Symmetry: C5
Subunit: 124 residues, 5 copies
């Protein structure tokens, strides 16, 4: 009746678009839907997002407006940027790129370490 | 008709605004999404300032925090330790000391407590 | 029909809350209402607010989320305390340890700024 | 291409520095709302670096309430433009332009700062006083 | 009682105006409409927008509030340059923290980015 949510995006054209959501349990569906187009919401936290380690092999990258993509090398595309996969030995997996256009030798998109697995982060 | 609206940053960093029916329900909605790790607004320079008598039973979900023993306070993938007019401080020290909350002075406020 | 206004506050808990208003002539009522709770809207302008001189003795401090408070007479605004100062045009200022909250000088009196009565 | 049935919303900063957003029925009523609250001294958005840019043929009868300003003659006898507790003086520029600006101070990070420049362009009637 | 979209613009008078949109498939029409008036949405990404290379000869500049002028964007003028990719950039300025607008390079050509018809 008035139990509505609103999510604010930045689009592929850089436009500032807010999308209405019917209720709380439909929020993630909306996030994947517009993330599939390359739209993002909010800023990347300093040092990149932090996710559980057991969520790495099947993480839905559309939750943050990213997609997998292969070169003449398997990469992750996020805002006309490409991130490479790294292994750290607790175990961890980082996704980074070279700095510089350099708002303060590497800047990370996401780090997978520790924590307990969360199902909602996985590809349905 | 007329409502209220509160703006959050979620666990996925998303910018989500939540509708509220009326003023007497703002805190209920704050505790609710605070329990999920959602925050609203910025931490004031020098940390929040609460009355001294509100320390032993402060509802940390009001600011998106949770107690966690390894006894620490988790607020955004950050951990704060307890430290001791008298006063109590919750702090750390990184590179991006920085305090989350200070309890000192003031008269008590029952709305700040765990229901 | 299409006559709503929306005012954005920062609460006592630092939360970011926007309040709906029925129409323009009910805006000040909403400002005093949430102002008494300590909620503020917007930023304090550099050099403090500027009000007419004849509005000093009876200014509604709730219009900016402030309140009178005497310790063993101050103005409380966000866990900060401002002291009263005089100057001799004749101007009254509220200062603390210098950063100012409000300066009262010149101008013609404005009725809506006074405590209702 | 204007849609008759979709609402708009405009965000102001008031005389008390409060953040207030105003609802508008449709696109064709936006200007009416801008003049109304502009006459009270409310502003929307920031002054673009180097000041606003308007067509030259709009200077003699520009509605200053469109940006929350007003004309004001002062004790010394000079005609000024008031915008947010600031006063701007009228200057002319011969090759042709017209400039409204004031001296810069300490509490102002970039010596002059300008409010509006009238130069070139073709006339637009919506900028004029009704 | 339905679910819409909302797009936030900065106008020709610098005002902050948000426009309602009926549904997702009508967003583009709204963008072209107010873009034709010089309204923009969001900020120009550092290093400028990035498009597919095959979208250059018939790009609808109204999608970002620009217009052809034998490119005008925000009272600024940008010149065409070739790379051997196509670059649109202007000189420096004493009022900005070469600065490029759009860069066409690689990628697969996209439907909607073209002037309709």
């Amino acid at each position: 009746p008035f139990t509505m949510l609103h999510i604010e995006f930045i689009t592929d054209l850089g436009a500032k678009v807010t999308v209405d959501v019917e209720s709380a349990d439909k929020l993630l569906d909306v996030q994947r839907q517009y993330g599939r187009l390359g739209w993002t919401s909010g800023e990347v936290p300093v040092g990149g997002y932090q996710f559980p380690l057991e969520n790495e092999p099947d993480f839905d990258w559309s939750l943050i407006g990213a997609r997998k993509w292969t070169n003449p090398e398997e990469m992750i595309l996020h805002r006309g940027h490409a991130y490479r996969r790294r292994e750290l030995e607790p175990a961890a997996v980082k996704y980074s790129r070279g700095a510089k256009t350099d708002p303060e030798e590497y800047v990370t998109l996401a780090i997978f370490r520790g924590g307990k697995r969360q199902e909602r982060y996985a590809v349905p």
